[PDB]
Design a protein around this ligand. Sequence first.
Ligand SMILES: Nc1nc2cc(C(F)(F)F)ccc2n1Cc1ccco1
Lengths: 222, 220
Amino acid sequence: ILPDSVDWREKGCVTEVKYQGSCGACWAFSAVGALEAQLKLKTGKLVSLSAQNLVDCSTEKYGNKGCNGGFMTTAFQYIIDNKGIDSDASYPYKAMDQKCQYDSKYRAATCSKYTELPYGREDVLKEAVANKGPVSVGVDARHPSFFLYRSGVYYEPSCTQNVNHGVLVVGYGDLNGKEYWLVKNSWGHNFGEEGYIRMARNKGNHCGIASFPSYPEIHHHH
Amino acid sequence: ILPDSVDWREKGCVTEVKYQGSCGACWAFSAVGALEAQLKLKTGKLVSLSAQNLVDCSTEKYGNKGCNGGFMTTAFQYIIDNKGIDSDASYPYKAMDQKCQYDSKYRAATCSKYTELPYGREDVLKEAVANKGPVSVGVDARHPSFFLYRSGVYYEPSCTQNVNHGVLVVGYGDLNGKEYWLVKNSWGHNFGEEGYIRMARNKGNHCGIASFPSYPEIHH
Ligand SMILES: Nc1nc2cc(C(F)(F)F)ccc2n1Cc1ccco1
């Protein structure tokens, strides 16, 4: 039976909010945020993983376009196929397309698989957020109400299920009975509530938050 | 000689900042803001003009796509061709595509002509803002730095001269040695400084602000 509220920040499973600047790397930040939590759960160590490693290395054979966008699922697939991802410390974020510079010497995490949740199932997304960890999702972020959000529970009647922005669901709850998803963005600590947005939950897959969810798992490190 | 600083809000030539919502009508808000200023300068009365009238009626013939974007200059051409535009009060903004509902009986303004300024010429834009009125421009707004802007003079190293968002230049000045354009947006009061942004001026056509400037005129 699921908790009424979850916040993976309280379990030490969520790194500081990142700023993607003028590079469309939301998909890469979403993916490494999902994997960071799995690394903490497995090892007890919270380590920022390299979004830049994904931008530079999870490219055309993964359907991804670096600063012009990508899939969280095919990011996880790169990490599986590459047998690792570098720490952010070793392979820092530059907000631009670079040649691949992955070095196994600075590998900080691996990925053995990823799980894709069923389209528009907010009940199933709630289970995965409670029991597995933070979940990579897409939202429709193409609304001034979204990018000028300051606080409270975001609800936008003009929102669609056509997602265009990769974000991380790190919990859920309710604010005076308005249910929400707790979403970590990569627009820096000045966006929203110190980089987070609470987005309407159980309002018909609002902004497509449950449209294409996925989460990675870790098997071996050595 | 041109003034050091200009602000057309000081002459009562600028309406309230509007909120376009989820409809890409920035081109329409920019076009009516530039015409609103000429209407005040002509009649002495400040009247908000119908961005919706443009979205609905300045369509295929003007290369405009309503909530999917358009051009301030072809909007001015619609007003010239149509022999008017309704007030915002008579033809309210709905943030969606609708059938043309223009009615000459609620006409609040006309347009006799529009002028397009030369590409990249911040000196010529300054002359127009000083001597003519607010100028419709496009900027490159596709930068988190732009939509997160809170105060000061916006400078983005990643900005390009490929413009995508219509806005209105209502002045210029110098804040702490940073030259700026004073820009009215259509993202409501929670964007920037109560709906305005100061954008870097004389920094090589920053964010394309002087790429495609235009202003309308009224004769009667
Ligand atoms: N002339 C002109 N006005 C423009 C307005 C916009 C804006 F998005 F801000 F509304 C973007 C481009 C614009 N151009 C250039 C052009 C020349 C042929 C096609 O487009």
